[PDB]
Amino acid sequence: EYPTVSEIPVGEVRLYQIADGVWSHIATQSFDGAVYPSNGLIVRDGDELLLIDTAWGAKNTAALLAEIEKQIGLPVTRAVSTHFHDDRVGGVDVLRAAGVATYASPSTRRLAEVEGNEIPTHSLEGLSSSGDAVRFGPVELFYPGAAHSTDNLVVYVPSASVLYGGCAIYELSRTSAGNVADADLAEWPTSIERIQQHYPEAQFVIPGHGLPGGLDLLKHTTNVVKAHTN
């Protein structure tokens, strides 16, 4: 069973193995009166691990590293943050202190700094234009256009047909718009179409928060945006 928000104490991280050499990591955090779950990704790259997003905060991210050591034993050597909010860069400084090389796009790095969030060290090149794709170790990084935020990236794992949508894709059980303070609500359905046109063969689709599904999460998310927008 995929771990749900009600089963993970704030401060603890679970790992869920999706495929061979592919896991999600799941944490929980208090935010704005509620507890929310949060997903990231872990992808094996031989004798090292590529981390996709922090576990939302310094303490959760240290827990993540401890859980990775317990359950996998391979070192995290690179990390990619998929947008500038705290559930994606909160913990970067812990990763850096632990010797992880932290990456984000130039936009994400700028927006993190503007906002006062932790800032990934290295800039990812080749992601400036909607539809750009880059092969980054075992994954493909993709910029679909502005949506949840103007900088959001998605991640695709070809070996396992895993599409990590981050917070530009909503789980089915969310039927209202959440955090749209930095969103391009008008562009968001267009960016979702772009993901669909590029990863039509996606089997396993991971939202930034909550339960994985399939490509039906894309259509579901547009409905939510439109319902909120119109």
The catalytic residues are 83, 85, 87, 148, 179
Does 87 contact Zn ion by CB under 5 A? Answer: yes
Q: Does residue 50 contact residue 16 with C-beta atoms inside 8 Å?
A: no
Does 208 contact ligand 8PL by CB under 6 A? Answer: yes
R_g (Cα) of the chain, nearest Å: 16
Nearer to ligand 8PL, 16 or 31 (CB): 31
Nearer to Zn ion, 175 or 197 (CB): 175
Q: Does residue 133 contact residue 117 with C-beta atoms inside 8 Å?
A: no
Q: Does residue 114 contact residue 150 with C-beta atoms inside 8 Å?
A: no
Strands across the sheet with 204-207, in order?
Answer: 133-136, 139-142, 154-157, 162-166, 204-207
Q: Does the annotation list 25 as a binding residue? A: no
Binds 1, which of ligand 8PL, Zn ion, none (CB < 5 to 8 A, cut-off by type)? none
- Which span sits near ligand 8PL by CB under 6 A: 96-104, 109-117, 172-180, 215-223? 172-180
Helix (H, G, I), strand (E, B) or coil at 158: helix
- Quote the least distance from Cβ 20 to ligand 8PL, whole Å: 29
Q: Does residue 167 contact residue 152 with C-beta atoms inside 8 Å?
A: yes
Binds 99, which of ligand 8PL, Zn ion, none (CB < 5 to 8 A, cut-off by type)? none
Binding-site ranges for Zn ion (CB under 5 A): 46-48, 85, 87, 167, 208
